[PDB]
Amino acid sequence: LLIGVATSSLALHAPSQIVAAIKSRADQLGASVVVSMVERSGVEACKAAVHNLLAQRVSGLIINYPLDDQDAIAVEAACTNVPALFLDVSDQTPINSIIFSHEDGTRLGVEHLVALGHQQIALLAGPLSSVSARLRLAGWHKYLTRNQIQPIAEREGDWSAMSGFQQTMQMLNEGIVPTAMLVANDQMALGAMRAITESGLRVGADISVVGYDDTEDSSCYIPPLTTIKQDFRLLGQTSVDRLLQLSQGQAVKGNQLLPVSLVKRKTTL
Amino acid sequence: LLIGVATSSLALHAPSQIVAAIKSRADQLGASVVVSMVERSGVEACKAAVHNLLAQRVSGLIINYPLDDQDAIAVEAACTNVPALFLDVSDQTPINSIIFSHEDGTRLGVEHLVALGHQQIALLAGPLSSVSARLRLAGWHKYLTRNQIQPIAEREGDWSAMSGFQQTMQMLNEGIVPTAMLVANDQMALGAMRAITESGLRVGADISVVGYDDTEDSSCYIPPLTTIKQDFRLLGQTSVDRLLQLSQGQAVKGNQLLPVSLVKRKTTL
Ligand SMILES: C[C@H]1O[C@@H](Oc2ccccc2[N+](=O)[O-])[C@H](O)[C@@H](O)[C@H]1O
Ligand SMILES: C[C@H]1O[C@@H](Oc2ccccc2[N+](=O)[O-])[C@H](O)[C@@H](O)[C@H]1O
């Protein structure tokens, strides 16, 4: 009936897209969404707004806000005898989550790139505050080690495209010249390919970028971005209608991993 | 105490930044914010919330849906009680506006093109139901005309990146090559640029593109996108601040418009 969505700042395109999509499904069956977004970072953050939300007596919550194992648990503790679905935690966190497959997203990147002939694979990560980022990092490691490779350089941004510039455009100012980079989201990838290009190198043939998300935009980057689609109009649906039977008292009582795919475009060669 | 925000799909970027900016001031004052999301088409659309958003008893309303001239009051009535503040109408309506000086905005863009040498200019419109898109075209139109200039081509579009592509292509494929395009917003200007790019041409140098927004993403297009900057931060600060000032009688009344600027990047190199 009325769904509250607490969501990490809507600036970044991804959760702004989740929100868009949570709605489109609640619309598909006349439920109502009220989104509340969180300050910045902190657990206290997410709670303050979870409150702001519970105060509108939403018939059920969807918590799309990066949270470590511990914090995450306390938020549910606070989620107060009302259906509560987490979208940005680890699956090892023992509550009510639906998160995309970090094991799968990270394999496919390394997987594809290793088989492409690449050796010098730079890593650009989300900020390590975000749980999802840390998984996606660890993720890449596992498969680069399983593959017996050291990353020539790993790095941190903040999901902002400009980070993908500043940071990738610095790695290069140090003689660290990869042949591929695995970029933690697409927005920073935009930065990455922008930096690579301007610093005088052909993206794709010269330093191939694999982004992460297939956000709405990225079909149009130049050239357009090989990436890891997470299907947000599904995390949209499944989560809406999970919270649905979940309101009625009708399972399922844990964590559902969602699959991914590699959208192979024009920045890998 | 609690501010309600109605908005066109969050999936577009600017409303987000706006929504996010509305927060950062509510944050600074100690207001809470709740945001609900308009079905992207109709007025039915928009006032089929505002309601779904008064079921929460919001201290005031900040309304970011494009509203034609009739629908404007047709809605300021529906609230009435109940202070409200439209963010997306004409500076011509007896409601309480705050918009961006499209005269200034559209001119700035024309002028710059005009002084830069061009006389073959295309116009990429916003969606013609968005009055904010309309107000712009006419701005371009009147100033473009004042220089005794006619556009080569005029195309519509849905604000989205993919249309910027779909449409710059449908243009070019006709055999219309402008030396510089005027484009409703940056999300579009992106697909705009990639369309140029792919049909063989150099962005800027062969067809310069002028955006409208300076969304966060824009400084990292390839190349950095020369655009008009609507300082969204300010709109938050101004509208949130004005909304309190409003809900206590002691407030300014009619439309209250605020300025914009041309940012010179590398798309008019
Ligand atoms: C905050 C991050 O959201 C990530 O999406 C993540 C990824 C997996 C599951 C949930 C979320 N989330 O936001 O709830 C994006 O991959 C990244 O661009 C960034 O926006
Ligand atoms: C719907 C449009 O919003 C525009 O911003 C508009 C433009 C002027 C005044 C207000 C708004 N608004 O959204 O409240 C953007 O220029 C454009 O990207 C598009 O998303």
Question: What per-residue string of b and e applies to B214-235 under the rule 16 or more CB within 10 Å gives b?
Answer: bbbbbbbbbbbbbbbbbbbeeb
Question: What per-residue string of b and e applies to A71-91 under the rule 16 or more CB within 10 Å gives b?
Answer: bbbebbeebeeebbbbbbbbb
Give the containing element (helix H, strand E) for A6: strand A2-7
User: Can you tell me the distance from the alpha carbon of B76 to that of B71, in angstroms, rounded to the nearest whole number?
Assistant: 9
Task: Take residue B167 and report the two structure tokens written for it.
Answer: 């449409």
A64: left (phi over 0), alpha (psi -120 to 50) or beta: beta
Cα-Cα-Cα-Cα dihedral sign, residues A237, B17, B14, A57: positive
Residue with CA at minimum distance from ligand 1 atom 5: A14
User: Can you tell me the distance from the alpha carbon of B115 to that of B178, in angstroms, rounded to the nearest whole number?
Assistant: 16
Q: Hey, is A258 helix, strand or coil?
A: strand
DSSP state of A60: E
Decide: B92 and B28 in contact? Cβ < 8 Å: no
Collect all residues from A whose CB is shorter than 8 A from any CB in B: 2, 9-11, 13, 16-17, 19-20, 23, 27, 32-37, 39, 52-53, 55-56, 160-162, 164-165, 187, 190-191, 193-194, 197-198, 216-217, 219-222, 224
User: Can you tell me the distance from the alpha carbon of B35 to that of B56, in angstroms, rounded to the nearest whole number?
Assistant: 11
The binding-site residues of ligand 1, defined as CB within 6 angstroms of any ligand atom, are: A 8, 12, 14-15, 18, 64, 87-88, 99-100, 130, 132, 159, 185, 212-213, 230
Which residues 6+ apart lie within 8 Å of A138 measured at CB?
A: none
Decide: B56 and B34 in contact? Cβ < 8 Å: yes
- Residue of A148, A190, A158 lying closest to B223 (CA atoms): A190
User: Can you tell me the distance from the alpha carbon of A43 to that of A67, in angstroms, rounded to the nearest whole number?
Assistant: 7
AA identity, residue B181:
M
Task: Take residue A83 and report the two structure tokens written for it.
Answer: 């259906």
- Residue of A151, A142, A178, A183 lying closest to A164 (CA atoms): A183
User: Can you tell me the distance from the alpha carbon of A50 to that of B202, in angstroms, rounded to the nearest whole number?
Assistant: 49
- Residue of A9, A77, A7 lying closest to A35 (CA atoms): A7
Q: Hey, is A109 helix, strand or coil?
A: helix
User: Can you tell me the distance from the alpha carbon of B268 to that of A246, in angstroms, rounded to the nearest whole number?
Assistant: 54
User: Can you tell me the distance from the alpha carbon of A243 to that of A237, in angstroms, rounded to the nearest whole number?
Assistant: 10
* CA of B64, closest atom in ligand 2: 14
In a 13 Å sphere around the CA of B205, the CA atoms on its Cβ side amount to 6
User: H-type helices in chain A, by residue range?
Assistant: 13-27, 43-54, 69-78, 102-114, 131-145, 161-166, 168-171, 186-198, 232-248
User: Can you tell me the distance from the alpha carbon of A205 to that of B78, in angstroms, rounded to the nearest whole number?
Assistant: 58
Strand ranges across the sheet with B154-155: B154-155, B121-124, B180-183, B208-210
User: Can you tell me the distance from the alpha carbon of A74 to that of A48, in angstroms, rounded to the nearest whole number?
Assistant: 12
Residue that is written with structure tokens 């109408």 in the block: B89
User: Can you tell me the distance from the alpha carbon of A200 to that of B168, in angstroms, rounded to the nearest whole number?
Assistant: 27
Q: Which ligand is nearest to the CA of A38?
A: 1
Decide: A10 and A16 in contact? Cβ < 8 Å: yes
Instruction: Indicate which technique resolved this structure.
Output: X-ray
Set of chain A residues whose Cβ sits within 8 Å of the Cβ of B193: 222
Decide: A183 and A212 in contact? Cβ < 8 Å: yes
Where do the domains of chain A lie, and which CATH numbers do they carry? 1-100+230-259 (3.40.50.2300), 101-229+260-269 (3.40.50.2300)
Set of chain A residues whose Cβ sits within 8 Å of the Cβ of B187: 217
Phi, psi of A33 (to 5 degrees): -110, 135
Interchain CB distance below 8 Å, B11 and A20: yes
* CA of A12, closest atom in ligand 1: 20
User: Can you tell me the distance from the alpha carbon of A146 to that of B124, in angstroms, rounded to the nearest whole number?
Assistant: 50
Strand ranges across the sheet with A208-210: A154-156, A121-125, A180-183, A208-210
Q: Hey, is A87 helix, strand or coil?
A: coil
Interchain CB distance below 8 Å, A37 and B19: yes
Set of chain B residues whose Cβ sits within 8 Å of the Cβ of A6: none
- Residue of B108, B53, B56 lying closest to B264 (CA atoms): B108
**Residue A44 vs residues A166, B78, B255: alpha-carbon distances, Å:** 30, 37, 39
CA-angle at B46, arms to B106 and A53, nearest 5°: 110
Q: Measured between CA atoms, how close is A69 to chain B, in angstroms?
A: 27
- Residue of A34, A77, A7 lying closest to B2 (CA atoms): A34
- Rounded distance from Cα A232 to ligand 1 centre (Å): 10
Interchain CB distance below 8 Å, A10 and B32: no
In a 13 Å sphere around the CA of A231, the CA atoms on its Cβ side amount to 11
Q: Can you state the angle between helices B161-172 and B186-198, rounded to 10 degrees?
A: 40
A18: left (phi over 0), alpha (psi -120 to 50) or beta: alpha
B57: left (phi over 0), alpha (psi -120 to 50) or beta: left
Looking only at the bridges linking them, the beta strands covering B2-8 and A84-86 are unpaired
Looking only at the bridges linking them, the beta strands covering B154-155 and B121-124 are parallel
Residue with CA at minimum distance from ligand 2 atom 17: B185
Task: Take residue B36 and report the two structure tokens written for it.
Answer: 């609900």
Interchain CB distance below 8 Å, A220 and B13: no
Interchain CB distance below 8 Å, A16 and B16: yes
Total residues belonging to chain A: 269
Looking only at the bridges linking them, the beta strands covering B60-64 and B121-124 are unpaired
Looking only at the bridges linking them, the beta strands covering A261-263 and B32-38 are unpaired
DSSP A192-256: HHHHHHHTT--BTTTBEEE-SB--SGGGGSSSPPPEEE--HHHHHHHHHHHHHHHHHT----SEE
Count other C-beta atoms under 10 Å from residue B104's C-beta. Answer: 17
Interchain CB distance below 8 Å, A190 and B221: yes
Task: Take residue B213 and report the two structure tokens written for it.
Answer: 């927004």
- Residue of B6, B42, B16, B5 lying closest to B187 (CA atoms): B16
Decide: B213 and B229 in contact? Cβ < 8 Å: yes
Of B33, B197, B220, the CB nearest to A162: B220
Q: What is the 3-state secondary structure (H, E, C) of chain B?
A: CEEEEEEECCCCHHHHHHHHHHHHHHHHHCCEEEEEEECCCCCHHHHCCCCCCCCCCCCEEEEECCCCHHHHHHHHHHHCCCCEEECCCCCCCCCCECCECHHHHHHHHHHHHHHHCCCCEEEECCCCCCHHHHHHHHHHHHHHHHCCCCCCCEECCCCCHHHHHHHHHHHHCCCCCCCEEEECCHHHHHHHHHHHHHCCCCECCCEEEECCECCHHHHHCCCCCCEEECCHHHHHHHHHHHHHHHCCCCCCCCCCCECCEEECCCCCC
The binding-site residues of ligand 2, defined as CB within 6 angstroms of any ligand atom, are: B 8, 12, 14-15, 18, 64, 87-88, 99-100, 130, 132, 159, 185, 187, 212-213
User: Can you tell me the distance from the alpha carbon of B120 to that of A111, in angstroms, rounded to the nearest whole number?
Assistant: 48
Looking only at the bridges linking them, the beta strands covering A154-156 and B2-8 are unpaired
DSSP state of A8: S
DSSP bridge partners of A180: A121, A208
User: Can you tell me the distance from the alpha carbon of B258 to that of A84, in angstroms, rounded to the nearest whole number?
Assistant: 42
Count other C-beta atoms under 10 Å from residue B5's C-beta. Answer: 29
Phi, psi of B238 (to 5 degrees): -80, -50
* CA of B8, closest atom in ligand 2: 1
Question: What per-residue string of b and e applies to B118-146 under the rule 16 or more CB within 10 Å gives b?
Answer: bebbbbbbbbeebbbbbbbbebbbebbee
**Residue A61 vs residues A170, A230, B31: alpha-carbon distances, Å:** 41, 21, 21
Set of chain A residues whose Cβ sits within 8 Å of the Cβ of B33: 36-37, 52
